[PDB]
Design a protein around this ligand. Sequence first.
Ligand SMILES: Nc1ncnc2c1ncn2[C@@H]1O[C@H](COP(=O)(O)CP(=O)(O)OP(=O)(O)O)[C@@H](O)[C@H]1O
Ligand SMILES: *P(=O)(O)OCC(C)(C)[C@@H](O)C(=O)NCCC(=O)NCCNC(C)=O
Ligand SMILES: CC(C)[C@H](N)C(=O)O
Length: 1186
Amino acid sequence: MGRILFLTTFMSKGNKVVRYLESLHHEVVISQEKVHAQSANLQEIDWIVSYAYGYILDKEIVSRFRGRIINLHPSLLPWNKGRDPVFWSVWDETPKGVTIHLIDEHVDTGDILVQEEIAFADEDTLLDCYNKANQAIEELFIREWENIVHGRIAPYRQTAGGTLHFKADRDFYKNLNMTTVRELLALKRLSAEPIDKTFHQLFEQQVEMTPDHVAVVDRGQSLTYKQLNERANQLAHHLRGKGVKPDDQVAIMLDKSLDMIVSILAVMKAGGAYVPIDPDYPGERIAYMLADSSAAILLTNALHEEKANGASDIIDVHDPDSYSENTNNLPHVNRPDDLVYVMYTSGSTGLAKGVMIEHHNLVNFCEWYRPYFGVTPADKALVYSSFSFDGSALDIFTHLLAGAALHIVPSERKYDLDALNDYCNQEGITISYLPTGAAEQFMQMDNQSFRVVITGGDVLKKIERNGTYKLYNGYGPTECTIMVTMFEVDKPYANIPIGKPIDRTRILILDEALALQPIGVAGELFIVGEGLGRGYLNRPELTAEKFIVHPQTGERMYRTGDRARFLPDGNIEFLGRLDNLVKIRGYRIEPGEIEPFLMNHPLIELTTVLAKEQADGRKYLVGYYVAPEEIPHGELREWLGNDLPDYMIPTYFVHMKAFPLTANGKVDRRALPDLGEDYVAPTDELEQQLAQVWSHVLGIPQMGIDDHFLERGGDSIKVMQLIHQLKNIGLSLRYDQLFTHPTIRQLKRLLTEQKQVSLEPLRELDEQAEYETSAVEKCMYIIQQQDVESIAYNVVYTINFPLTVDTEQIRVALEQLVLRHEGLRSTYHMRGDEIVKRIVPRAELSFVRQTGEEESVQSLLAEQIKPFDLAKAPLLRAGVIETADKKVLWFDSHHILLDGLSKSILARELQALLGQQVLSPVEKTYKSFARWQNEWFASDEYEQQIAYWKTLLQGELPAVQLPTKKRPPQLTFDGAIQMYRVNPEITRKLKATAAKHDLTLYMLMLTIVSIWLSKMNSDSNQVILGTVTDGRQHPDTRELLGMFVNTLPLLLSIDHEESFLHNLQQVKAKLLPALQNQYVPFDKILEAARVKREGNRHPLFDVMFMMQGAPETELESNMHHINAGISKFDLTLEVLERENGLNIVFEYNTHLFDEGMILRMVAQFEHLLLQAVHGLDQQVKRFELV
Ligand SMILES: Nc1ncnc2c1ncn2[C@@H]1O[C@H](COP(=O)(O)CP(=O)(O)OP(=O)(O)O)[C@@H](O)[C@H]1O
Ligand SMILES: *P(=O)(O)OCC(C)(C)[C@@H](O)C(=O)NCCC(=O)NCCNC(C)=O
Ligand SMILES: CC(C)[C@H](N)C(=O)O
């Protein structure tokens, strides 16, 4: 007995505890709003129970309810006070539990009533942890409420300690809610957070260690560490006497030589930063670098003095008057934050940018380099790269701090890989950095000298090399000091990783909102740590855009513009530039993904795929490959056709003896040479007549005669369009005939007779008070009347919009769609015998506006999912839930109106309206199709279709009996969901395999499902499973809203003695007749099998398999189907094509399968699918489930 005030997040939050309190005869008042000190909520209140409440109570209310305010907080206080306690308990690795406590003047600090610990498994997602913690604290309350009111609980004080978090603290981590505990802590180690020496301080130290060792070697001219230091001191004294101060730039224009090394060190010791200028650069680049730089002094000699055009003061390094007699180390004037050098990135003059690197950047890299590669003074290093390229900083600075010797590559032998190898073998060169392009050609040479070869700068593809040296792949932008990650290439990889970060460096993968990405999810690569340079010279606005302060973490980081993702082992995978993404026939492609498939060819050693644009603007791919002899164009398409769909196969192929290289040793992509070769223009009146129809169905211009219909985007839907468009020219073609003759050259043989030319449009009906319903509408109506409160046939979708979209523009667009489509203004009524349809001229759309937290969205949607009265229009409800970061549009509909294709139409028209576009009126109406089809049921064509099912469904029908629990006594619909993602690479292989063997992706997946079912049913030779078709019988219905879908049983045979490919063809043979006779209402198919809708099982099949194609619009691709805890069948498998992969959803009945069984079945499906794709000619009996 009492009166309790329940303050919680939303209406249904804490259902169990309210029901328990009410069962004890307490009166509960639920509220989520703020409580005023004087209000109706407060008067006559015994207890106040709060659970995830969103507001703080006034000091006066906490006073008037001393010892009467109980709070349910899902953490082990004092750990994780405040917001998101479960998440922070996992991320911070704190003790875990739930606490019921009193509310005091000080928040989340009142005396504990009861506390208990809780455990989270490694494989649980953060969402499961959240729900588990809530369940535990609610059960704890129910268990102890009696021992609270009666006073059996003695409160005790919280210990001082723990943690605290606020609302916005979680913003950076918003993408992590579906990641497991193990995966979250792995990410934490990779994401969560001193040098006080300059480089010349470290070099001067290295000299005192090895003063007599060789430092530099140039054509028999030698210089020891002590000689090098003294000469540098001589020039440095003079330079500082000329006014060299810290952060001052000094230009150097010299050829690789002893003087270059002496000049670089002299500028450091003097106190300034050097700006290297390669004398071999074009004149305009030299002039640009000298102008953009603030250097007033230039070190050069006579041969290059003229190239400067007298732009600054010149100091001749050959003149003895530039060297002071003093050879003593200068006194230090440099801080580690002072510039050490400035190097320019690629680009035209004015675009190219000067990158400012600081002493501490360089020291950090050199200290990591020496131990990582084990550099001892006995090592011989090569100075290969131009000294205007930061690859030379690697060559020079890392080895001078390890006592090793630098060897000045002689000009006549850098671009001759053969002589270079000879110089390295003869001289004993052990370590060197070679850019990717040059390194891949150096691998051919027989070398015995090198211990380690480091490459980088471009995508490394070849690793087969003659030699015993270790191969390393390094990555990094000039902006972050040479390299930030390193990887030891140990074996072949389709994509060679770029490795793990170096000392005091972290790599973050962020999304477009700068939010952390889970491990394995691709995003933009950001860099944090000691490698970040100062920025771009004379360019503060560009610096602020690329060197950002993160708005949540406050940390400084560099936006690289590269795409990448972490691998499970901590290594990183480069995925290309974010700009190089090009679209071809409506597919976002990374051309780099095609190359490794050309590499696998036995006769190809190097390859590079590019994107180009014709004068028209059309995109098209070209493939360059290196091989001894030219490979036929056809043999290449067939080779690539094993793993890639046609849109990723280059239109052209170019054979070359070798790739040209740039100065920096990268492949010169701009220097490669500049309707495909397999086109066979039509030469016939019929040939040309079909090449035009195919072009319109496939949406491709200038179609050829040897072009395979499926390889170029054809599917079941587009095969229907082809047939109906050939009936437009009196040419009759059947469904199965297209798959035997999938090209115009072959198909033309069967198109001679020009009869059966019946052009019949769908006819509009005269106005009537009432209209006839279709066959499927009658079935749906009768089902709904069996339980009018059931939501099992509601259809719920959501769409995430940005906060910048206007809620009211969305409402208006939906209201216009109610006006556009009579389906949204249709009602259903039972007039004695018949089920009848009425149409209203106008209908009012229910549109609800709400606000809430992201964590509450699904709970708020579930409260809105209610039955539809089929006699009332519109059969659609909608609303918008605004959170802190987005607006979630939801709409609920009934299956009698919205089917799969109807959703696609609704999404396309909604996208147009939000874009301020005008739509042409809808020409046909569903009610006219219903009258046309009801009459078609009296024709002879219908008699023949039903005759197919009478024959097939006679007698012995297989019984697929999966291992379940004891079935309930009647039909249940309680369901849950599990998901399996097939990545793009495997999805492409599946797609390529299907087309190559005259199969659709659907036929290929249906066969895998059938083998899967068979394996679970004691390798049964036959299986039965349902599927669905769009059911758009009349071609004038493809833009209407309504229910057209028809259900079909499939009797399939699996021959475990035959190969996968053989079973694939046998599934096609059984599917096509079923599609040819698909237009019989499912109720008549149940008659033909003498089965009725009764019992605890669904009549003909327990397993349903359905599949949808890729989305037609950006909006549709952002639509998510929400399951309301319903399972129409024992088990449904749905395959959706999303983001170049397959999302496979297993919807199952919870009374028949528990989570343990489903998790095993999903694991077995994946394993079976991977064996199939890789084992086409393998016998099915050799595929195993575990
Ligand atoms: N191992 C590696 N693998 C793949 N790409 C790499 C790589 N190492 C470096 N890169 C790429 O090269 C870029 C940095 O090259 P930098 O020389 O520092 C500027 P750049 O000279 O203007 O390059 P550019 O001429 O290719 O445009 C990186 O962003 C990355 O895209
Ligand atoms: P082909 O490419 O082998 O496809 C065969 C199908 C799938 C039978 C094809 O004819 C077809 O009917 N595609 C549309 C199927 C469809 O509508 N799936 C979604 C139905 N789902 C809902 C919720 O309505
Ligand atoms: C090693 C260095 C040259 C770096 N990888 C770059 O490409 O700029």
